[PDB]
Design an enzyme around this catalytic site. Structure first.
Site, PDB file in Angstrom:
ATOM      1  N   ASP A  56     -30.482 -16.566 -27.728  1.00 18.07           N
ATOM      2  CA  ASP A  56     -29.207 -16.797 -27.058  1.00 18.07           C
ATOM      3  C   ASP A  56     -28.996 -18.295 -26.889  1.00 18.07           C
ATOM      4  OD1 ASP A  56     -27.851 -17.276 -24.170  1.00 18.07           O
ATOM      5  OD2 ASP A  56     -26.976 -15.488 -25.090  1.00 18.07           O
ATOM      6  N   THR A  89     -21.695 -18.758 -28.107  1.00 14.80           N
ATOM      7  CA  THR A  89     -22.137 -19.975 -27.441  1.00 14.80           C
ATOM      8  C   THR A  89     -22.916 -20.884 -28.379  1.00 14.80           C
ATOM      9  OG1 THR A  89     -24.311 -19.284 -26.657  1.00 14.80           O
ATOM     10  CG2 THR A  89     -22.396 -18.466 -25.476  1.00 14.80           C
ATOM     11  N   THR A  90     -23.313 -20.381 -29.549  1.00 12.66           N
ATOM     12  CA  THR A  90     -23.971 -21.230 -30.534  1.00 12.66           C
ATOM     13  C   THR A  90     -22.974 -21.812 -31.524  1.00 12.66           C
ATOM     14  OG1 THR A  90     -25.941 -19.841 -30.339  1.00 12.66           O
ATOM     15  CG2 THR A  90     -25.843 -21.359 -32.188  1.00 12.66           C
ATOM     16  N   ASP A 393     -24.346  -9.310 -24.028  1.00 13.56           N
ATOM     17  CA  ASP A 393     -23.426  -9.821 -25.037  1.00 13.56           C
ATOM     18  C   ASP A 393     -22.577  -8.701 -25.620  1.00 13.56           C
ATOM     19  OD1 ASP A 393     -24.526 -12.274 -24.553  1.00 13.56           O
ATOM     20  OD2 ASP A 393     -25.052 -12.696 -26.639  1.00 13.56           O
TER      21      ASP A 393
HETATM   22  N1  LIG Z   1     -22.819  -8.594 -41.079  1.00 17.47           N
HETATM   23  C1  LIG Z   1     -22.410  -9.882 -41.017  1.00 17.47           C
HETATM   24  N2  LIG Z   1     -22.005 -10.534 -42.126  1.00 17.47           N
HETATM   25  C2  LIG Z   1     -21.598 -11.812 -42.076  1.00 17.47           C
HETATM   26  N3  LIG Z   1     -21.559 -12.536 -40.947  1.00 17.47           N
HETATM   27  C3  LIG Z   1     -21.936 -12.008 -39.763  1.00 17.47           C
HETATM   28  C4  LIG Z   1     -22.394 -10.617 -39.734  1.00 17.47           C
HETATM   29  N4  LIG Z   1     -22.705 -10.347 -38.455  1.00 17.47           N
HETATM   30  C5  LIG Z   1     -22.466 -11.470 -37.729  1.00 17.47           C
HETATM   31  N5  LIG Z   1     -22.008 -12.461 -38.511  1.00 17.47           N
HETATM   32  C6  LIG Z   1     -21.634 -13.834 -38.082  1.00 17.47           C
HETATM   33  O1  LIG Z   1     -22.508 -14.370 -37.087  1.00 17.47           O
HETATM   34  C7  LIG Z   1     -21.783 -15.396 -36.407  1.00 17.47           C
HETATM   35  C8  LIG Z   1     -22.288 -15.640 -34.990  1.00 17.47           C
HETATM   36  O2  LIG Z   1     -23.266 -14.685 -34.597  1.00 17.47           O
HETATM   37  P1  LIG Z   1     -24.439 -15.112 -33.583  1.00 17.47           P
HETATM   38  O3  LIG Z   1     -25.670 -15.375 -34.410  1.00 17.47           O
HETATM   39  O4  LIG Z   1     -24.491 -14.120 -32.449  1.00 17.47           O
HETATM   40  O5  LIG Z   1     -23.977 -16.542 -33.008  1.00 17.47           O
HETATM   41  P2  LIG Z   1     -23.047 -16.729 -31.708  1.00 17.47           P
HETATM   42  O6  LIG Z   1     -24.048 -17.130 -30.655  1.00 17.47           O
HETATM   43  O7  LIG Z   1     -22.087 -17.826 -32.093  1.00 17.47           O
HETATM   44  O8  LIG Z   1     -22.403 -15.388 -31.465  1.00 17.47           O
HETATM   45  C9  LIG Z   1     -20.328 -14.961 -36.418  1.00 17.47           C
HETATM   46  O9  LIG Z   1     -19.501 -16.057 -36.811  1.00 17.47           O
HETATM   47  C10 LIG Z   1     -20.248 -13.870 -37.461  1.00 17.47           C
HETATM   48  O10 LIG Z   1     -19.266 -14.214 -38.437  1.00 17.47           O
HETATM   49 MG   LIG Z   2     -24.047 -15.318 -30.081  1.00 20.95          MG
END
Ligand SMILES: Nc1ncnc2c1ncn2[C@@H]1O[C@H](COP(=O)(O)OP(=O)(O)O)[C@@H](O)[C@H]1O
Ligand SMILES: [Mg+2]
Ligand SMILES: Nc1ncnc2c1ncn2[C@@H]1O[C@H](COP(=O)(O)OP(=O)(O)O)[C@@H](O)[C@H]1O
Ligand SMILES: Nc1ncnc2c1ncn2[C@@H]1O[C@H](COP(=O)(O)OP(=O)(O)O)[C@@H](O)[C@H]1O
Ligand SMILES: Nc1ncnc2c1ncn2[C@@H]1O[C@H](COP(=O)(O)OP(=O)(O)O)[C@@H](O)[C@H]1O
Ligand SMILES: [Mg+2]
Ligand SMILES: [Mg+2]
Lengths: 535, 154, 154, 523, 59, 60
Positions: A56, A89-90, A393
């Site tokens: 996170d 948040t990332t 989340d």
């Molecule tokens: N199955 C998937 N295919 C492509 N991109 C994905 C998929 N699942 C999540 N993402 C991408 O992961 C990004 C952020 O996810 P995450 O790692 O939780 O970071 P954050 O903390 O910003 O939410 C999003 O921009 C989303 O587009």
């Molecule tokens: Mg996230």
């Protein structure tokens, strides 16, 4: 030094602008390896050896010690994204650090930063206006499918990734179980009104949803019963102990014969209150204050269950769900004290269960309203804590979707389209601002690069293909369907993400752009620094 | 009346608060002295140009001091022309030229990048700001010149 | 100037000088220091030429009086019922800060605050203690608003 | 003077971290893998206070070890979750976790992303569970001789294996007694009602399970009786002593007759208490707090027996055994709260010390296990072994299923998974097979501790299971020959196996999702 | 920090230690509390008398 | 904001408002004005004066 005797160190010119950029850049590099479904996790070991595992973004930054002021601005930037939205948040931290780095090279070339700042603000305002063209209506999509897919997408890149279908069903059901009907026509979904409990033991696939409420408390005494099949719940907010005169009142005895009656009344006032409570049919007593050992005996003989030291926030939810009314006293609009039967809660069952060497209390099928709670199981405590943060989340994402019926594709389809649009739109300004806008479009492109790099693929070929596809969507409006091409990380290819079921709430992309731009502007307006020595 | 200020950081909020507090004080000055004056360094170039012509009238040791006071006013119009990335010598020379053959509203124009009429750009400021700035400055300088010694006490 | 800890005794009168202009005017707190700086700088040449400091102090006061009459002849009267003039004055003193972008929203707000506190017919002074500024985190600058009532935090 | 950004925080990353954690996990396994099988030897540990822990328990070894490494702290923790959950199998869980984590680095060095391995691991876990339930054996709890063999198969690996025939009887009788159905339909087998008492000396063949409870107390006044046949008992909570109030009291006295009258009023109040207790005609009075000297005088007059200052943990056991319930105020003493389910009260001397016995209950729901032996250290190992047996018996009574022991189940599961992986196409095929092959570390450890050939015996046993109906064949842990488990008679509850596999798989998933370490940030 | 011309304010803040200089400071403080002016003239005159007094002793 | 009394009956006391640019000027102005008030109060008590500017010293 000579002039300006200040007893401190000052820096001016290119010295402080370059130093600020590196301090901001280093923060991004810590969390750059925690983005996307191919992301990984981190430990954070303090001095006393307490371990913590999480990816996170907000949690990591809050646990670090930073003293450079240019970096502390980013730490609270991620914190604000948590409170306002709760997801992405990332993404916000990465964008902010990329905006500064890309703008710095513009300032090294003789461009006045106030021109750059105005260029950024125009780009942000136009981007948000454009993003209201990539809208997908929730009601147009299936109600359950859109919620489930949105929960699954926001649950990826976590410890419960492949367990989405099991957990997504739990998450949506819990949210719909707390739907509230409010003024005129506004619904309300107060998440964090669902109690989440952790207990190590069996696998996480055996974590169970509870249709009712769960309390982390045990019955007061052993002799008392431990299961009630039809509960008449009474909620109280005051202690049940032997009474005692207030601090202002004293006791002076001049006739010894009156002493015996004096001491009885201390233990007899409390007895009468209990009998008023138990005469109306109450089976379960809940109290935030304590209960004396003598007061427990009356519940034992009458065959009733009682609990002491109950948290306030827990009592508020049970009273709302079971229809009971919280009492801080017994007095009524007249002198005497009464306890009517129209002020009692009702539940279908109260059971004390055993969960891995300890016990807790379950309240099932409250009739006034519906309530739910979740118990999570895992290998140990560190792993149990991770699903809890990884479930908060999921709750927030669903709540934002239900409140605002609009979602946008994930995987980078948003950034790929905006970069194409801004580059084409800047050509009609005809001033030094187009340079700043073009730098804004290129800075947004960092997200699709970061996703592909972490998957050990060709981040140059993949992103180049997207720019070709999104370009053919802007022109040739027969192929307008190609504005949903996103990114696949398993096979390293483009795929239609709307049909694939990758969704994010619009309030994540919209708010992240606004917050990132403001943090980039304030840092950009500093040319010198003065630090004073400690006293 | 009350105003609520929002923001994203504590640093931005405090700087947003101070900026509002000046906008309020500018309006307050406009009620104490119902007079308006052109900005952009116009009051300073015009101050220097007329004082130079005034020095030639005086004779003796006084003429030099007024000349020094006249040239000290050129600092501000040069400072604005410097922060905008212009040639300070070229701009101030153009300003003093244009104030000595007519218009007095001529001033620096950052948006255009040169010198143009100021009131067409809708940049003004209250009279009390210019008068009070000058009066408090000269009173302090006259106080500084009276000092002769420094000693250390308990 | 207040936050920095200047140690020279003659550099600790400039911090008080800037606080003087803030109290009376609330604007021009930087410019008045620059003017006071250049007057003292121009004094170092005169003392080398042989001028006694007493002559310098008297001559500056002569120049100060002439400076007042030039500015007054340059000014222009303003009537409080003219809303457009007030906006141009407020936005000019506001576009020099970080919120220059949001001046398109704050400038009409600032004037509204002053017009809802005083009576333009008999306005001889304005008290800013009847206007309260409340600072609240979250959101951006663009979310500020003016409340015609009372706001309580508790 | 110096410019800093993070102020003294270390950081590591890259393939060094992934290899660092795995090498730390295997090291813990190497410490404990000598304590598996009937031929297991003991270890002795040293504590900060100077005691000696001579133990064979898997959890007991690890909880006396201090380790800085973050990776090792995970392995220590999952040890105690297993013990608190099912009480047995704290060694096989660790050995599996190390092996399932060690056969994974082979794929990492072949540029395989961890998320590919993780999806393969949790996919193999579901087929592991389904296969286990297929070969499950139903048991009939009404057969006593069958339940003795279940407990015997779980203590033949410990020190009491010499006295096994006695131990199974002690464990079985206690659990069969604490079983309690109550209001509603909540059946429980709580274990705070089975006290274990150690007394050094005698012989281990003097151990017995009492129908009742024992107390380390003695009669307050010597004249009070020490041998009663059928006592009528009452359990109190308050104190028989004139104690002060709490309402800011004070007495002002201005006459000669007020000082003496006040003192006489305290003795009348006590006489009020003693008379009310006598109204119910009991023979034994048990109370939590002190008893005044006056109160004893009235009670000994009515031929009562009293006990002072008994712990709240002991009243709750007495209340459940005799049949009484605790009453705080004597004014509300009735006939329904007097316990008449005892059959004897006796006070003996055990080595210059007085004990109180309440035995021969009509139907007790609480028991007290009495242990005698050489010294404290030996008895400490006895109760740790007995607790495992009583936890083993309980799991059978809640989920009546059995699966073959001795490594038969692991090979049966290994064969089933391998035959299923050849219908799988893709890169996940390889991790799906290495996870199954990692189960064979259980029979391999048994062979090495016996002193046999681990290459010859294991290949013959793998070839055996390839046939159609031989799923119950396992390895004998005393001679080293493949024997069927039907005739040898080794079984363990289905609950133990399920938790061992589930905990092992999930821990390997946790540590395979690591990429970097940050340290020393001082909260 | 303070800027002053008064001859009594200066002599109050100075931390003199010579025994004879403390006599001069004491007259200036008393003179200020008496008539409020002439604090500078009294100390200069009281010092110029001693300047001539040392030459006379040398004769 | 200060309370203003106007048109008083006696007026045997007064207040004086001092203005200036720095705290050093305000303190100096107040301390200088103390000398003038005191020496004038002594003159009213005893109204005999002696010439100055060095005229007095040269005579004695
Ligand atoms: N199955 C998937 N295919 C492509 N991109 C994905 C998929 N699942 C999540 N993402 C991408 O992961 C990004 C952020 O996810 P995450 O790692 O939780 O970071 P954050 O903390 O910003 O939410 C999003 O921009 C989303 O587009
Ligand atoms: Mg996230
Ligand atoms: N649009 C503009 N064009 C030219 N000059 C401007 C403009 N806006 C403000 N200024 C100048 O900025 C100067 C002072 O602004 P500011 O930075 O607030 O300093 P101060 O603190 O002295 O007021 C004024 O002299 C004014 O002439
Ligand atoms: N007589 C025996 N022959 C072969 N294997 C045995 C025998 N008794 C027990 N085992 C095996 O020992 C294994 C573990 O028992 P134990 O040594 O108590 O370790 P733990 O219970 O901590 O895993 C079980 O899987 C069981 O199959
Ligand atoms: N305009 C003047 N012309 C001549 N002498 C003056 C004038 N004003 C003041 N003085 C002289 O200056 C002398 C010193 O006075 P002042 O400077 O106040 O120091 P002190 O503290 O001793 O009074 C006095 O003796 C007075 O006669
Ligand atoms: Mg300004
Ligand atoms: Mg075992």
């Amino acid at each position: 030094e000579g002039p300006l005797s200040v007893f401190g160190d000052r820096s001016t010119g290119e010295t402080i602008r370059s130093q600020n950029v590196m301090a901001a850049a280093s923060i991004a590099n810590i969390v750059k390896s925690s983005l996307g479904p191919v992301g990984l996790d981190k430990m954070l070991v303090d001095d006393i050896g307490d371990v913590t595992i999480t990816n996170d973004g907000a949690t990591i930054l809050k646990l670090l010690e930073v003293e450079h002021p240019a970096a502390k601005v980013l730490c609270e930037l991620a914190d604000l994204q948590d409170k306002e939205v709760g997801d992405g948040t990332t993404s916000v931290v990465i964008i902010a650090a990329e905006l500064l780095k890309n703008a710095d090279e513009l300032v090294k070339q003789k461009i006045h930063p106030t021109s750059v700042i105005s260029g950024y603000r125009l780009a942000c305002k136009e981007a948000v206006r454009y993003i209201n063209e990539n809208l997908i209506v929730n009601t147009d999509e299936l109600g359950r499918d859109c919620l489930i897919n949105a929960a699954k997408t926001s649950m990826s890149s976590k410890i419960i990734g492949i367990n989405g279908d099991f957990f997504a069903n739990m998450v949506v059901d819990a949210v719909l179980a707390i739907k509230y009907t409010d003024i005129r026509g506004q619904p309300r979904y107060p998440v964090n009104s669902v109690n989440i409990l952790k207990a190590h033991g069996r696998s996480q696939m055996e974590s169970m949803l509870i249709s009712g409420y769960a309390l982390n408390c045990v019955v007061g005494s052993q002799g008392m019963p431990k299961r009630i099949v039809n509960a008449k719940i009474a909620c109280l907010d005051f202690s049940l102990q032997k009474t005692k005169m207030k601090l202002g009142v004293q006791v002076v005895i001049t006739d010894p014969e009156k002493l015996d009656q004096i001491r009885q009344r201390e233990s007899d006032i409390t007895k009468e209150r209990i009998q008023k409570i138990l005469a109306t049919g109450a089976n379960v007593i809940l109290t935030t204050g304590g209960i004396d050992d003598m007061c427990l005996k009356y519940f034992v003989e009458a065959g009733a269950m009682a609990v002491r030291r109950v948290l306030k926030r827990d009592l508020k939810r049970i009273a709302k769900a079971s229809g009971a009314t919280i009492l801080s006293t017994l007095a009524n609009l007249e002198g005497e004290e009464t306890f009517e039967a129209a002020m009692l809660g009702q539940a279908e069952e109260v059971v004390q269960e055993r969960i891995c060497d300890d016990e807790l209390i379950l309240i099932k099928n409250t009739k006034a309203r519906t309530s739910a709670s979740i118990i999570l199981r895992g290998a140990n405590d560190f792993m149990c804590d991770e699903m809890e943060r990884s479930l908060h989340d999921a709750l927030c994402v669903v709540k934002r979707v239900l409140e605002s019926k609009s979602v946008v594709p994930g995987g980078g389809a948003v950034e790929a389209a905006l970069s194409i649009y801004l580059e084409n739109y800047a050509t009609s300004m005809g001033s030094r601002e187009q340079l700043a806008i073009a730098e804004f479009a290129r800075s947004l492109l960092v997200i699709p690069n970061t996703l592909a790099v972490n998957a050990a693929q060709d981040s140059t070929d993949l992103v180049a293909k997207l720019r070709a596809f999104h370009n053919e969507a802007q022109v040739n409006p027969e192929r307008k369907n190609l504005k949903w091409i996103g990114l696949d990380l398993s096979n390293g290819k483009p795929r239609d993400n709307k049909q694939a079921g990758v969704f994010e709430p619009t309030i994540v992309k919209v708010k992240s752009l606004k917050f990132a731009t403001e943090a980039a502007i304030t840092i950009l307006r500093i040319d010198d620094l003065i630090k004073l020595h400690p006293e | 009346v009350t105003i609520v200020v929002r923001g994203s950081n504590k640093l931005v909020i405090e700087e947003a608060e101070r900026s509002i507090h000046d906008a309020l004080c500018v309006i307050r000055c406009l009620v104490k002295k119902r007079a308006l004056i052109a900005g952009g360094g116009a009051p300073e170039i015009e101050l220097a140009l007329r004082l130079t012509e005034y020095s030639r009238t005086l004779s003796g040791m006084e003429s030099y001091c007024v000349r020094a006071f006249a040239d000290a006013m050129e600092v501000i119009p040069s400072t604005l022309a410097e922060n905008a990335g212009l040639n300070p010598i070229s701009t101030v020379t153009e300003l003093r030229n244009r104030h000595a053959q007519g218009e007095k509203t001529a001033g620096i124009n950052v948006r255009k990048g040169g010198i143009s009429n100021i009131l067409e750009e809708l940049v003004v400021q209250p009279l009390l700001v210019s008068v009070s700035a000058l009066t408090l400055a000269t009173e302090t300088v006259r106080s500084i010149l009276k000092i002769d010694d420094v000693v250390n006490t308990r | 100037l207040k936050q920095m800890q200047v140690l020279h005794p003659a550099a600790r009168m400039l911090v008080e000088l800037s606080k003087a202009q803030d109290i009376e005017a609330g604007d021009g707190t930087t410019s008045v220091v620059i003017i006071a700086g250049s007057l003292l700088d121009s004094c170092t040449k005169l003392l080398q030429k042989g001028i006694h400091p007493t002559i310098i102090s008297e001559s500056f006061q002569k120049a100060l009086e002439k400076g007042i009459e030039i500015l007054t002849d340059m000014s222009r009267p303003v009537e409080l019922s003219d809303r457009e003039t007030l906006l141009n004055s407020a936005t000019t003193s506001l576009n020099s800060k970080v919120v220059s972008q949001y001046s398109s929203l704050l400038s009409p707000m600032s004037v509204n605050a002053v017009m809802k506190v005083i009576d333009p017919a008999t306005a001889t002074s304005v008290d800013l203690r009847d206007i309260k500024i409340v600072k609240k985190l979250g959101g951006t600058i663009d979310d500020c608003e003016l409340v015609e009532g009372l706001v309580l935090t508790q | 003077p110096v410019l800093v950004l993070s102020q003294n925080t270390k950081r590591e990353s890259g393939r060094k971290v992934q290899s660092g954690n795995i090498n730390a996990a295997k090291t813990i396994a190497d410490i404990i893998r000598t304590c598996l099988g009937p031929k297991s030897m003991m270890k002795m540990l040293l504590d900060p206070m100077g005691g000696i822990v001579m133990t064979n328990d898997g959890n007991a070894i690890l909880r006396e070890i201090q380790v800085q490494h973050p990776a090792a702290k995970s392995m220590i923790e999952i040890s105690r979750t297993q013990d608190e959950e099912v009480g047995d199998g704290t060694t096989s869980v660790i050995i599996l976790a190390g092996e399932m984590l060690s056969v994974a680095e082979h794929f990492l060095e072949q540029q395989m992303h961890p998320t590919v391995v993780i999806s393969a691991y949790r996919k193999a876990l579901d087929d592991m569970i389904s296969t286990l339930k297929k070969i499950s054996i139903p048991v009939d709890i009404s057969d006593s001789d069958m339940m003795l063999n279940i407990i015997n198969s779980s203590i033949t690996t410990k020190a009491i294996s010499r006295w096994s025939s006695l131990a199974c009887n002690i464990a079985l009788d206690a659990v069969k007694m604490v079983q309690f159905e109550e209001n509603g339909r909540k059946e429980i087998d709580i274990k705070k009602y089975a006290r274990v008492e150690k007394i050094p000396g005698g012989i281990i063949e003097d151990s017995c399970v009492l129908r009742g409870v024992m107390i380390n107390k003695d009669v307050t006044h010597p004249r009070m009786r020490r041998y009663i046949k059928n006592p009528r008992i009452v359990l109190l909570d308050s104190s028989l002593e004139y104690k002060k109030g709490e309402s800011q009291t004070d007495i002002e006295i201005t006459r000669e007759e007020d000082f003496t009258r006040i003192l006489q009023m305290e003795e009348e109040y006590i006489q009020q208490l003693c008379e009310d207790i006598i109204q119910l005609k009991p023979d034994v009075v048990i109370t939590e707090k002190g008893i005044s000297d006056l109160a004893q005088h009235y009670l000994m007059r009515a031929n009562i027996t009293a006990i002072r200052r008994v712990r709240k943990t002991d009243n709750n056991r007495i209340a459940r055994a005799c049949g009484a319930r605790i009453v705080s105020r004597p004014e509300e003493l009735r006939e329904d709260d007097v316990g008449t389910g005892a059959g004897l009260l006796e006070i003996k001397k055990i080595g210059d010390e007085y004990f109180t016995f309440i035995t021969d209950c009509k139907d007790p729901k609480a028991c007290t296990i009495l242990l005698r032996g050489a010294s404290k250290e030996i008895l400490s190992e006895v109760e740790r072994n007995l607790q495992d047996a009583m936890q083993v018996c309980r799991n059978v009574l809640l989920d009546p299923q059995l699966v073959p022991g001795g490594g038969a189940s692991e090979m049966a599961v290994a064969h089933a998974l391998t035959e299923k992986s050849k219908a799988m196409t893709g890169v996940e095929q390889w991790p799906y097979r290495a996870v199954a092959q990692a189960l064979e570390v259980i029979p391999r450890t048994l062979i090495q501790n016996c002193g046999a050939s681990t290459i010859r015996l294991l290949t013959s046993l793998r070839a055996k299971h390839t046939q159609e109906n031989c799923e119950t064949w396992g390895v004998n842990g005393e001679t080293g020959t493949l024997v069927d488990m039907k005739e040898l008679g080794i079984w363990e509850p289905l609950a133990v196996k399920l938790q061992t596999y589930k905990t092992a798989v999930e821990t390997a998933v946790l540590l395979l999702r690591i990429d970097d370490i940050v340290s020393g940030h001082k909260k | 920090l303070m800027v002053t011309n008064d001859g009594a304010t200066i002599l109050k803040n100075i931390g003199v230690d010579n025994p004879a200089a403390k006599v001069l400071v004491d007259m200036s403080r008393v003179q200020d509390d008496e008539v409020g002016d002439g604090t500078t003239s009294v100390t200069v005159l009281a010092a110029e008398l001693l300047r001539e007094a040392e030459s006379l002793i040398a004769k | 904001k200060l309370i203003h009394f106007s048109g008083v009956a006696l007026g045997e006391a007064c207040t004086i408002v001092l203005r200036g640019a720095t705290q050093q000027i305000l303190d100096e102005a107040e301390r200088s004005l103390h000398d003038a008030l005191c020496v004038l109060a002594q003159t009213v008590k005893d109204s005999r004066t002696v010439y100055g500017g060095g005229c007095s010293e040269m005579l004695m």
